Amino acid sequence: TIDWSGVAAAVAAAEATGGTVGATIVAPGGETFRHNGDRRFRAASTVKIPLMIAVYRAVDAGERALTDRIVLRAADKAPGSGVLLHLHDGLELTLEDLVYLTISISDNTATNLLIDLVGLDAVNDVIASLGMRDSNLSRKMKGRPALPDEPENWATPDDYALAVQALLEGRAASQESCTAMLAMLEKQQNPRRIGRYVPEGEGIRWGSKTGSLTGVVNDVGFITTPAGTLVVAVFTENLPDLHAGEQAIGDITRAALQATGLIPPGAA
């Protein structure tokens, strides 16, 4: 039987300076810890998950292929995270390159190119089909939060946990595509959040999609060991700074790994 007190303590410490945490964490058994699970947070880059799903569903339907060519144009270059914004106009990429850049390093140009290819409606169709009732993609990547009167991309921890579960269960798209998408998440380049206290060892894997904006630090993903898989969706808002946000997610995740017996028991 699971003791969540350490996870609750990690959450309380993260919120002590006045910020807010939302967390939905699903144990191997299916038992679920929720704190502000249905509260609305800025998704930031985590919304690139359902975008990726829309892409692979298009590939499943044979509407496009991973080897399809897309050319980098000056008009497409977005501010914020990514590398394409600084690479030469005319660079020829593939659809798979775009998915990879989108997920691994949160490339905003690659993201907006995929949004153009598949369209907003297709991503929102994915979100609805996954039972994600309070989430959406309505705004291309700009590297900044929307102003109050501009459409924002909203998430809830509950919704993003459903998204990861769908991938793990082969429900999000075809099983081949779910397997490929989980492998993309494993290519996440920032190990400081969900990834921080994942132990090194055989048969251990993790993947996630981070999200960051000023006052916003999120990470959504999974950790798999031979003993089972932990689903983790944590959103944080108005913590003191980036460091505090990353530390909070790492601590909450670590406490969850201990609570579910995925790593050995340890300090809170």
Side-chain angles (χ1 to χ4, degrees):
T1 176
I2 300 170
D3 183 346
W4 295 105
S5 68
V7 178
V11 169
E15 297 184 326
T17 52
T20 298
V21 171
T24 296
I25 295 163
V26 187
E31 183 177 335
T32 299
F33 172 92
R34 293 191 205 268
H35 175 87
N36 285 330
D38 64 355
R39 177 164 173 156
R40 301 162 181 108
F41 294 81
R42 298 183 198 274
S45 290
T46 64
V47 72
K48 298 174 184 184
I49 288 170
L51 169 61
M52 176 179 59
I53 296 168
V55 172
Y56 284 81
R57 289 198 182 171
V59 175
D60 292 342
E63 295 163 347
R64 34 188 84 261
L66 288 177
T67 51
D68 283 350
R69 325 303 267 201
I70 296 83
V71 176
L72 179 67
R73 262 54 144 107
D76 309 312
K77 292 181 162 163
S81 53
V83 75
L84 295 181
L85 45 10
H86 298 303
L87 298 186
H88 78 273
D89 293 333
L91 182 70
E92 193 163 344
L93 302 144
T94 57
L95 179 58
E96 183 160 28
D97 292 340
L98 298 188
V99 174
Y100 169 76
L101 296 171
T102 290
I103 299 303
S104 66
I105 68 161
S106 213
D107 193 305
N108 282 347
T109 297
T111 298
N112 294 350
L113 286 171
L114 296 176
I115 294 182
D116 282 343
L117 285 175
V118 93
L120 295 172
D121 282 273
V123 181
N124 289 303
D125 290 342
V126 161
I127 291 166
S129 77
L130 291 184
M132 300 165 66
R133 295 313 209 92
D134 299 301
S135 300
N136 68 292
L137 173 67
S138 297
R139 173 182 157 98
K140 277 186 169 170
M141 304 300 117
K142 297 158 194 300
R144 57 174 143 88
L147 301 178
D149 60 337
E150 303 170 332
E152 180 60 279
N153 302 325
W154 299 109
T156 69
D158 282 351
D159 282 4
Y160 274 76
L162 297 173
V164 176
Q165 289 177 298
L167 290 170
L168 293 169
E169 298 168 10
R171 277 189 298 101
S174 78
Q175 177 59 75
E176 175 188 319
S177 292
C178 292
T179 300
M181 284 184 281
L182 288 167
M184 282 294 176
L185 292 168
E186 292 175 31
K187 292 192 174 55
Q188 175 52 243
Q189 295 201 355
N190 181 6
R192 296 172 187 80
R193 308 179 193 181
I194 285 168
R196 184 170 161 179
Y197 296 105
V198 176
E200 307 296 67
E202 307 286 59
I204 292 150
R205 350 184 65 83
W206 74 276
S208 86
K209 181 68 192 78
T210 51
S212 315
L213 257 15
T214 160
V216 172
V217 182
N218 313 324
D219 204 9
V220 170
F222 67 95
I223 298 164
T224 291
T225 83
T229 296
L230 185 75
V231 174
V232 176
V234 177
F235 291 73
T236 83
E237 165 183 305
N238 300 318
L239 302 206
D241 46 41
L242 170 66
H243 169 267
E246 300 195 309
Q247 178 124 268
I249 299 171
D251 287 342
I252 287 165
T253 299
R254 185 227 261 123
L257 287 165
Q258 294 167 354
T260 59
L262 259 22
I263 64 186

